[PDB]
Structure formats: C-alpha cells, structure tokens
A = this chain, B = another copy of it.
Amino acid sequence: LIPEIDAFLGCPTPDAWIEAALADQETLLIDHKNCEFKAASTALSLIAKYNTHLDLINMMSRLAREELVHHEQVLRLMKRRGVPLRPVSAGRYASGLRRLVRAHEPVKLVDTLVVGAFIEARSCERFAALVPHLDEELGRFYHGLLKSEARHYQGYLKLAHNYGDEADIARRVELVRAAEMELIQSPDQELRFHSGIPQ
C-alpha cells in the first residue's frame, strides 16, 4: 500500500542539519544539482545492468528524463542567483546505503530498488523540512520538487514488489531503514543534501 513518508523513514531531518543548510545554501544548491544528475545516472546504470527488464527500463528511462529536467532547473536557479559551478564531491549517503545490497540476483535488484525508495523518501522529507525557512522562490521550487520525490519513492518501492516477494522486501526495508537513520543522525564532516549532522 506504500507507507507515508514519515512512517517509512527512520528519523526526521535533524534541526542541526537545517541550520547548517540555511547557512550554506550555495553548497546545498550545488549538491542538490549533483544529486539530480546522480539520480539520472543511477537510473541509466540500472537500465544497462537489467537490459532486458522491460518494466524497469521504461520506468527508468522516463525517471532519468525527469531528473535531468530537475538538474537543468537547479542549474538555471544557480545562474539566476550567481552561484558558481564549484566542484562538490559526493557525500557518504548513497554509497553507504549501496553497501547493504545483497550480491546475488534477484534480491540484488530488489535491494537496489529499496535503496532508491529510501533516497527519494528522504529527499521528500528533507525538502519539506526546508521549505518554511527558505526565501519565497526557492521554497516554492522545493515544494514543487517535494511532490515528484513522493511519486519517485512510490515508484521504486512498487518496482521492488514487481520483482520480489513481500516477506523479502519487508526484511530489506527494515535493514536499510536502520542504516539510513544512522547516516542521517550521525555526525558528518560536511554539508550535503543527504549529509549527517555537522560537528
């Protein structure tokens, strides 16, 4: 039935992360831009690996296009606000979750899709947490992205059920949820969209 976002997630975005993000919105926007790109890149990696899974490929191709639209939309917002194209390395979050995916098919694919649902669900929750503190234009933008993330979280989890058993997805969601909460609540060195709490 797909749980609601806060139910699905193991913890709220911490206040300390919101404070850090509001104080460095330039790094936030750039890593946000990179996350949209990486979502599209990840979608295409799934097409490449599961290259005769027609349901997956059709969903992923369309998902990749929507994320590239978001990618371009952040670049245009950066241009409007004079944010420079500054290199920002990937954070620990997605690769930390990917470590949990099992090595053998078909549960390898199932685990990968569950991780995708968590990343989208956290993005939705975190956009929601930021909106009331942002200027009008950026809050409206992030509130607009909030609805697409909810759809993407639902899609990943639904695609997981198209390829895995209910009981096997249940255990996997429980395992990722615990690790995801740890990544969000533990201290992190720097500000990323999906980073932990700063020191």
Contact = CB atoms under 8 A, between A and B. Distances in A.
Interface residues of A, number: 24
Nearest to A79: B54
12 contacts: A37-B48, A40-B64, A44-B44, A52-B87, A54-B75, A57-B75, A58-B72, A58-B75, A61-B71, A64-B64, A65-B68, A68-B68
Given A61-B68, A65-B65, A71-B61, A87 B37 contact: no
* Copy count, this protein chain: 2
Given A51-B85, A85-B52, A87-B51, A69 B65 contact: yes
A86 B52 contact: yes
Q: Which of A54, A62, A64 has the most CB of B within 10 A?
A: A64
B37 A44 contact: yes
A185 interface: no
User: What 7 pairs across the A-B complex have the smallest Cβ distances?
Assistant: A52-B85, A41-B44, A65-B65, A65-B68, A61-B68, A61-B72, A54-B85
A51 B86 CA distance: 8
A41 B51 contact: no
Contacts of A52: 85-87
Interface in A37-95: 37, 40-41, 44, 47-48, 51-52, 54, 57-58, 61-62, 64-65, 68-69, 71-72, 75, 85-87
B37 A41 contact: no
A34 interface: yes
A69 to B, nearest CB: 7
Contacts of A71: 61
A176 to B, nearest CB: 25
Contacts of A48: 37, 41
A136 B61 CA distance: 27
